[PDB]
Symmetry: D2
């Protein structure tokens, strides 16, 4: 399923993002002078199951969760440098049941253990000066599709 | 290369659309009651090398070409019905040197013998009431990519 | 559909190779010091609809056709040097209805007009000492499948 | 990287199968009467990091590990039913660092937690009379490849 996720807006998944689900987010730009950019996987109740805060002007990428209302739990950060590849950077999220696997364009996958027991019913994209394009292309799979040779 | 082509707008290709190039256009919604929807592969001088006029109201899809300052050539026509797959219909275009191959979701491909000897420097998307989404995802390749087993 | 076409053998297709069909042949090796290597697409009556004779020594790649009991027709050739990429060289045959497109690893593809009005029922492979592996992997599609972003 | 893995034989990997690596194993046939079929991921020391024994008879698929000069540890087994899709059944193995993800054609992924802290340098295939074709097509990736929209 293909969705066009607009900045500071969101898309409702026609199907729950759950174990086996694969979400491939791709950007057609990558704005160097851009700042903090966020992607959130939302439960039906709109709790932030997976929060991805890309902070260029701070060389860090923060991963967290929190009830829509609640405060933020412990952060799980990793360096920002050498993660994305211009001009078409991307972010791939996979639901492995007990944790999320997140991959950028370079480096090893980041594994984020689930903290909130709910499937994602939507994906939000927030940014005041996004590092990416608006919208960003988003393909969501129910399962891992047959892979090409390269 | 990923581009986001908005309705009644266009996109400048990083490299020219030439022999071997593949363009994969994908929509995110498919509006069953949308009107005439067009896609134009434009040369540097704005010549319409390939014109794809999807006309649901006339149940036909028209292919043609014309120099910016010239007139349309004869029309290439094929039935519209049962060509697109909702909710994410697609259109693939491939430059085979002497002619373009156009594939939708179902049916046989369409071949349209080039009439202007030029490469494409951009692709336009036009519609007052479009069948597809704005924008449409467009992946441009320099050659056929590794094919998946499925 | 995946097949393992062994050298000096052939594989019977579960469905006819016809317009829109895609045969992606891949080798696990490139025995550069090899010799003449051939791939043939045969119809039910056993006519050779498409003959591809790769000759490293002569430094050319011959394309031809011939009926079951007939002599070869005129040849259509191209230089062989560097048309294949090690360690996994590939050949991709696509039926465009009136002609086949033959894709190697390098250089613009080659088109061959159909001489025999039949669909192929088997793909053959012959060689005294192949330039490729035995077998070669062959994925046959009824139509071009969705293309990955790259 | 493509390899043709023959039954009762193995293929020496170009690069180490390590975290991020993906191995797509595909067969051209499905021998319904076939007996126990095994695939082993081996360390340079020839220790069996991942052992996968498919037993149609006992309706089970066994996963284990052992040292070259060793006996089998406790078995992790799952039902054989609803895993393979003939005539081209597959098996995808992915190294997630602490564990291997294992996918067949049907059902949810299987996770086998690593027992031997070594990267695999080879992949073996053995059986008396295989359930799968000989050889099987194996595409090994250093990291997940770009995904087709569908
Ligand atoms: C340093 C700063 O100015 N603010 C930090 C906060 O950052 C927020 O982090 C959450 C996720 O943890 C989210 O990304 C939000 O958009 C950020 O502003 C946070 O780390 C804490 C309090 O939440 O304070 C500062 O560390
Ligand atoms: C009916 C009408 O107003 N115009 C018809 C022509 O339509 C144009 O067709 C070109 C491509 O050939 C292009 O799509 C343009 O936007 C259309 O207005 C044409 O279809 C026919 C053929 O002679 O003539 C006009 O009736
Ligand atoms: C060089 C040689 O020994 N024979 C040449 C011919 O080769 C045959 O070509 C047919 C297809 O055209 C087929 O490949 C057969 O197996 C080949 O032996 C032919 O290529 C040329 C004609 O230019 O004549 C011979 O030199
Ligand atoms: C003993 C025998 O001939 N077959 C079965 C055993 O097979 C071995 O099991 C190990 C354990 O993983 C490994 O698969 C080895 O390659 C096999 O030969 C064994 O699976 C079971 C008891 O665990 O007994 C026999 O059914």
């Amino acid at each position: 399923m293909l969705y066009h996720l607009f900045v500071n807006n969101q898309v409702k998944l026609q199907n729950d993002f759950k174990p086996e689900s694969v979400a491939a987010i791709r950007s057609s730009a990558f704005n160097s002078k851009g700042g903090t950019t966020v992607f959130n996987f939302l439960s039906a109740g709109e709790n932030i199951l997976l929060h991805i805060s890309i902070r260029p002007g701070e060389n860090v990428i923060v991963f967290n969760s929190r009830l829509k209302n609640g405060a933020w739990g412990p952060e799980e950060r990793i360096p920002y440098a050498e993660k994305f590849r211009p001009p078409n950077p991307s972010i791939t999220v996979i639901d492995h049941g007990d944790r999320f696997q997140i991959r950028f364009d370079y480096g090893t996958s980041i594994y984020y253990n689930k903290r909130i027991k709910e499937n994602a019913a939507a994906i939000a994209y927030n940014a005041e000066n996004s590092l990416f394009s608006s919208p960003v292309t988003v393909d969501v799979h129910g399962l891992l599709p047959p892979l090409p040779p390269a």
